[PDB]
């Protein structure tokens, strides 16, 4: 399961953290709600409120984010969207 | 296509508006990104920034919202999540 | 009893597996329903759902299959059709 980054507006590092915190979440948790919950909680930890996470295969979105704090990427089959709107 | 409301924390009226603005979006637009885009733009219009919309069939989420400004519902087959985190 | 391959759209290997799993089935089982049952169960094992098998001498067919996952061959006198439509 390699990551594709589809759209980012994110600190290159932060981008990695995210990609990391996702691979982990996907070990821990099988249900999407959990996975997204893991990664949200993480980032509110590492970086401040207020992050929102979406995970699935089948969805689109229209959303507003703080500059530099948005990322959207596959982890093989599964799509992860993560942003702060604080 | 009847609506099921799964979770709300929303002005009963607002709840309706949302449900309405969704049935419309689903006439207009076929791609999910558009649909969600329609409804987001709407609510930022009617009620202020800053709303985020997700639409699909297959996804879960972990997200933080302003009190009274969250709703999550099916429109038959298709799932709509809408909240302000302003 | 040598095999003739009549029509395939199959991994060359897979093609062999099939041809193999057929020669076996024809040792085990005398009734056609069994034979086909053997080979179906096999392939759902080895490769995933959802395979359907037909065996006889006297039949034709009109059927829709996943790309790369269809094969139709004699084992001397007896005709074997196998595909996944998953």
């Amino acid at each position: 399961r390699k990551a594709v980054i589809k759209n980012a507006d994110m600190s290159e590092e932060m981008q990695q953290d995210a990609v990391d915190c996702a691979t982990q979440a996907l070990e821990k948790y099988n249900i999407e709600k959990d996975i997204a919950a893991y990664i949200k909680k993480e980032f509110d930890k590492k970086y401040n409120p207020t992050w929102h996470c979406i995970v699935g295969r089948n969805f689109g979105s229209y959303v507003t984010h703080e500059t530099r704090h948005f990322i959207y990427f596959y982890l093989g089959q599964v799509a992860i969207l993560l942003f702060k709107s604080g | 296509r009847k609506a099921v409301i799964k979770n709300a924390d929303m002005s009963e009226e607002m709840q309706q508006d949302a449900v309405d603005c969704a049935t419309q979006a689903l006439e207009k637009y076929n791609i999910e990104k558009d649909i969600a885009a329609y409804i987001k733009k709407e609510f930022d219009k009617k009620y202020n920034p800053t709303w985020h919309c997700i639409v699909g069939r297959n996804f879960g989420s972990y997200v933080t919202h302003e009190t009274r400004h969250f709703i999550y519902f099916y429109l038959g087959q298709v799932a709509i999540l809408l909240f302000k985190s302003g | 009893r040598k095999a003739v391959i009549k029509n395939a759209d199959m991994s060359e290997e897979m093609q062999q597996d099939a041809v193999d799993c057929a020669t076996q089935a024809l040792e085990k089982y005398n009734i056609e329903k069994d034979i086909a049952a053997y080979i179906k169960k096999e392939f759902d094992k080895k490769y995933n759902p959802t395979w359907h098998c037909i065996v006889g001498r006297n039949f034709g067919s009109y059927v829709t299959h996943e790309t790369r996952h269809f094969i139709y061959f004699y084992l001397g006198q007896v005709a074997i059709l196998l595909f996944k439509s998953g």
Binding site: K6, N7, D9, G56, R57, N58, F59, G60, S61, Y62, V63, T64, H65, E66, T67, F70, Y72, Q77, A79, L81, F83, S85 | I31, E32, K33, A36, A37, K40, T50, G56 | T64, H65, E66, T67, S85
Partner: peptide
């Protein structure tokens, strides 16, 4: 600043048939 973004997903097209 803030920016607004779409994200649709390419639900991996059904394998030819």
């Amino acid at each position: 600043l803030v920016y607004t973004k779409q994200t649709q997903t390419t639900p991996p097209k059904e394998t030819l048939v």
